[PDB]
Design a protein around this ligand. Structure first.
Ligand SMILES: Cc1cc2nc3c(=O)[nH]c(=O)nc-3n(C[C@H](O)[C@H](O)[C@H](O)COP(=O)(O)O)c2cc1C
Ligand SMILES: Cc1cc2nc3c(=O)[nH]c(=O)nc-3n(C[C@H](O)[C@H](O)[C@H](O)COP(=O)(O)O)c2cc1C
Ligand SMILES: C=C(C)c1ccc(C)c(O)c1
Ligand SMILES: C=C(C)c1ccc(C)c(O)c1
Ligand SMILES: [Cl-]
Ligand SMILES: [Cl-]
Ligand SMILES: [Cl-]
Ligand SMILES: [Cl-]
Ligand SMILES: [Mg+2]
Ligand SMILES: [Mg+2]
Ligand SMILES: [Mg+2]
Ligand SMILES: [Mg+2]
Ligand SMILES: [Mg+2]
Ligand SMILES: [Mg+2]
Ligand code: NA
Ligand code: NA
Ligand code: NA
Ligand code: NA
Ligand code: NA
Ligand code: NA
Ligand code: NA
Ligand code: NA
Ligand code: NA
Ligand code: NA
Lengths: 399, 399
């Protein structure tokens, strides 16, 4: 069915429908597919789904000139810990990714691989089964009691990374980025958001280190910036973006309760701008808005009203993608896209609307999403959401 | 004469005319007199002007419930270096300040002493004459070539403060604050803006130190925060405010060209909010806007459009005074005061309009200021600017 109480607005008369260049890619509109984990990859080997993933991405690439950021992809076995999320370290994985990228490109759209390291969000028992550590910034603060207990039960207590192990992750980011580009991707996004490993280093709650990787703003940002620099060197700044969620609380990050949080993220933005002014400007910065501090809460819940991401625009002067509860709020989008370097990521409603871009242009009703199939091993709730035309044929205008 | 091309707007229907409590003081409106050095103090001894200062402040206190921040006042001889700016270290000074404070209070208005240490902005030859150092954060970067040369010619080269000398300034801030309160002031403002000593520590251009007072965001903020903490302890948080100018370039500060500048100031704001949440909230934060990066340039010049002070509001949750080119822009004030904890400082047009508050309420023409008498040893351009009534009697409506 369509979302019942929603009053759509046509956004075709706004900058959402003006072309913009992101990295090497000439986008034809500014509605971006943010990274969306869907848990259809198959075990063993974290293989992108051989039956359905091509169709899923093909459907969502249908509007020419769309920027798609993939579901998060693990850079190595040690970076993972969810059996049904994909990786980008192995030949078999890349066989499937190549098909996905080719399909997106045949639709005249673009694809950026999000590179993920889970840290304390991983399942410690999966990691123990596979002979892998359970990693984070620190060893004395935990995501939650259940994770701590699971790690102990698995004889795999949370481990604070050594400098050597940080370097090994950096090597894996580099190789994952190379693999992604060689397989045909347009670029990569470094996931430094939503409470995963890099965010665990950024945040003073999760990072109690006293070496060069913690204990100050510069130190907490060090790992993120080393990854940025390593990827810029390996594949070029025009092929690299960075995702941040300053106000996020998902995965036990601090959000606005931490009075130093804006400074921490302002420092990162400033360091990116310094690199840009020195000739190496990242393709984009992607921000999760305080509109959505936890993306598993229904739209309108978990909204933080005590902060804005606007500060980033005073500092970073390149493209900015903003995501969080924008599908149901075209009136907010209309205002934000008056800024000529702002793009809008639409997550949950791109899950349910393969033709979302047309719907945004034309002010059409939106398909309701089914949260129960966000993570499910099924084509249902993955590739069977209808286009607007298909929904009319199903009678959804009368449901 | 009145400003010729100005189209006034009555602001009586805005929050500019709603009462607000700042520290211990119940303000009746939100038009603040920011600190304005006028150079009428007499030498020797940096004595507030015995003939005219009471009248100057009495005139500008005329609207009941006005918050006045004094001209900058030196905390000690070593903190000074301009012969005609006042101090707050000596009995003779305080005799004159007591008369000023009493006069302001008789008009049912309030007075906060701005506490100043000049650093590299001081005149090194005046300091040498008096047996005093020429101080800054560093010894290898200078305000400008003329200052560097004057210091060398005076056998008083710029000196990088020792930790002991920083502590001595802190002792002087404490005693100056005590003196101010004992003489009847309502509070003090710590000047950490406009390129004076504390700002010289905040800014990475002027602060090349490698000890605990430089080399990182936390370290550059250390001296400012030590002064805050010392004054809060001495006289109470309700009697202390802090002035900052994130985007200022006056006195050779970096402004927005420094990509880390927002982070530096976000850190300070965050540390103030942390103290507030722990029970010691400063009375206010006073910000100079990027509207005026140098207050000796005509309104509209030196405007930085690449940044906003709005970030501070995501971090610090108390009152905020904003200053910079607001008198000529009631349309901007009307928007900013929609925020219910925002006050507006009016500098140059309070020099020329003793009854500015009435003029703002009622949308009256403004007296043009005379920059040539901003710093002059004269009653002219100090105490002889007319009220609106007086200006009408002079025929200024027909000039
Ligand atoms: C099912 C689901 C999976 C997600 N997976 C990822 C991910 O792999 N990487 C990521 O950075 N964010 C991920 N997110 C967060 C989204 O990219 C997005 O920031 C969030 O859903 C807010 O946007 P929305 O309100 O448009 O959905 C996910 C969100 C959902 C609901
Ligand atoms: C003559 C003059 C003297 C000033 N003296 C001081 C001072 O003692 N302390 C201070 O913090 N700012 C001082 N300022 C800066 C003002 O407080 C204010 O921030 C600036 O003039 C911008 O506001 P305006 O456009 O309303 O004048 C001075 C400015 C002027 C023009
Ligand atoms: C890579 C995965 C599993 C993922 C899931 C959800 C979110 C919000 C995310 O950032 C990442
Ligand atoms: C204390 C003095 C001399 C002063 C003068 C001008 C400005 C802008 C300031 O901040 C301070
Ligand atoms: Cl619904
Ligand atoms: Cl799993
Ligand atoms: Cl004029
Ligand atoms: Cl002088
Ligand atoms: Mg251990
Ligand atoms: Mg906005
Ligand atoms: Mg169902
Ligand atoms: Mg020397
Ligand atoms: Mg504003
Ligand atoms: Mg003259
Ligand atoms: Na419409
Ligand atoms: Na099938
Ligand atoms: Na802005
Ligand atoms: Na789950
Ligand atoms: Na269905
Ligand atoms: Na009017
Ligand atoms: Na006289
Ligand atoms: Na705000
Ligand atoms: Na002068
Ligand atoms: Na005159």
């Amino acid at each position: 069915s369509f979302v019942k109480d929603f009053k759509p607005q046509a956004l075709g008369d706004t900058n959402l429908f003006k072309p913009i260049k992101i990295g090497n890619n000439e986008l034809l509109h500014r509605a971006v597919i943010p990274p969306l984990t869907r848990m259809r990859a198959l075990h063993p080997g974290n293989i992108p789904n051989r039956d359905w993933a091509v169709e899923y991405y093909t459907q969502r690439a249908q509007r020419p000139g769309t920027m798609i950021i993939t579901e998060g992809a693990f850079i190595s076995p040690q970076a993972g810990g969810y059996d049904n999320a994909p990786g980008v370290w192995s030949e078999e994985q890349m066989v499937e990714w190549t098909k996905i990228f080719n399909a997106i490109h045949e639709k005249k759209s673009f694809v950026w691989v999000q590179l993920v390291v889970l840290g304390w969000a991983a399942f410690p028992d999966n990691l123990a089964r596979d002979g892998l550590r359970y990693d984070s910034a620190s060893d004395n603060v935990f995501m939650d009691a259940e994770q701590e207990a699971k790690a102990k039960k698995a004889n795999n207590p949370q481990h604070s990374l050594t400098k050597d192990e940080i370097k090994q992750y950096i090597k894996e980011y580099v190789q994952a980025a190379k693999n992604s580009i060689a397989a045909g991707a347009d670029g990569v996004e470094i996931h430094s958001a939503n409470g995963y490993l890099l965010n665990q280093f950024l945040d003073p709650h999760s990072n109690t280190r006293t070496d060069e990787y913690g204990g100050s703003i510069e130190n907490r940002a060090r790992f993120t910036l080393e990854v940025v620099d390593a990827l810029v060197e390996a594949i070029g700044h025009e092929k690299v973006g960075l995702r941040l969620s300053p106000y996020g609380v998902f995965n036990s990050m601090s959000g606005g309760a931490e009075t130093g949080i804006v400074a921490q993220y302002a420092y990162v933005a400033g360091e990116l701008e310094k690199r840009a002014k020195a000739g190496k400007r990242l393709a984009f910065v992607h921000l999760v808005e305080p509109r959505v501090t936890n993306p598993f809460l229904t739209e309108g819940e978990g909204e933080y009203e005590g902060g804005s991401n606007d500060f980033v625009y005073s500092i970073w002067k390149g493209p900015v993608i903003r995501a969080g509860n924008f599908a149901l709020h075209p009136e907010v989008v209309r205002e934000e896209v008056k800024d000529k370097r702002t793009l809008i990521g639409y997550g949950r409603f791109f899950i349910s609307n393969p033709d979302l871009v047309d719907r945004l242009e034309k002010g059409l009703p939106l398909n309701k999403y089914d949260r129960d199939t966000f993570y499910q091993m099924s084509a249902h709730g993955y590739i069977d959401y209808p286009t607007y035309e298909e929904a009319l044929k199903l009678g959804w205008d009368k449901k």
